[PDB]
């Protein structure tokens, strides 16, 4: 007599890359390696208005606004001390590969959660500069 274990299963968490979704057609982007040392970014617009027979210039200032996002992955002290140590017996090797799988899962989870947070921040900043339909149906 036996108990049949009909296989174990899991979801391979796919990375949803920020340019792999079509939300990034709303936002062009530049990898800026040092956003920590940019306190402010402005853009000057010189717009020239022509005159019509029966001159004006709109110099408008626009400012950037930064966004911080942060989640918190977590790791036990067991799978760091068994990660630094070296195995010699294959039961310890099987423990070690499981611990490095857990830590790699947590790291890939961290960057994946950060990427999903980037899409969330993009959706929030687009909704913040979004007036409703019944005003811009007329004002346009």
């Amino acid at each position: 007599k036996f108990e049949v274990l009909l296989g174990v299963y899991t979801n391979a968490i796919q990375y949803v890359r920020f340019l792999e979704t079509a939300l990034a057609v709303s936002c062009v982007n530049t990898e800026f390696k040092d956003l920590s040392r940019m306190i402010d970014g402005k853009i000057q617009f010189r717009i020239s208005v022509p005159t019509i027979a029966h001159q004006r210039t709109f110099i408008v200032v626009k400012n950037c606004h930064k966004h911080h996002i942060s989640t918190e992955m977590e790791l036990s002290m067991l799978d760091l001390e068994i990660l630094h140590s070296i195995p010699e017996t294959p039961v310890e090797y099987a423990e070690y590969v499981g611990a490095v799988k857990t830590v790699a899962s947590a790291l890939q989870f961290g960057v994946d959660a950060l990427e999903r947070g980037l899409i969330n921040t993009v959706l929030s900043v687009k909704l913040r500069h979004a007036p409703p339909m019944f005003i811009l149906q007329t004002l346009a």
């Binding site: 296989g7 174990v8 299963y9 899991t10 979801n11 391979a12 796919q14 977590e74 790791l75 036990s76 067991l78 799978d79 039961v91 099987a94 423990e95 499981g98 611990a99 799988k101 857990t102 947590a106």
Partner: protein, 46 residues
């Protein structure tokens, strides 16, 4: 419950199982389930 928490070679399929998951488990659609948050999310020891 009857849940075994031993490590495994978890075969990875591409079906997104988790459509309305945490509301389902807090409602208890499953017979027996284990919510592991934080430190216990690792492979337990042999």
């Amino acid at each position: 419950e009857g849940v075994e928490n031993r490590p495994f070679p978890y075969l990875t399929v591409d079906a997104d199982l988790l459509s309305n998951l945490r509301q389902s488990a807090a409602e208890g659609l499953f017979h027996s389930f284990d919510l592991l948050v934080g430190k216990d999310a690792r492979e337990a020891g042999i």
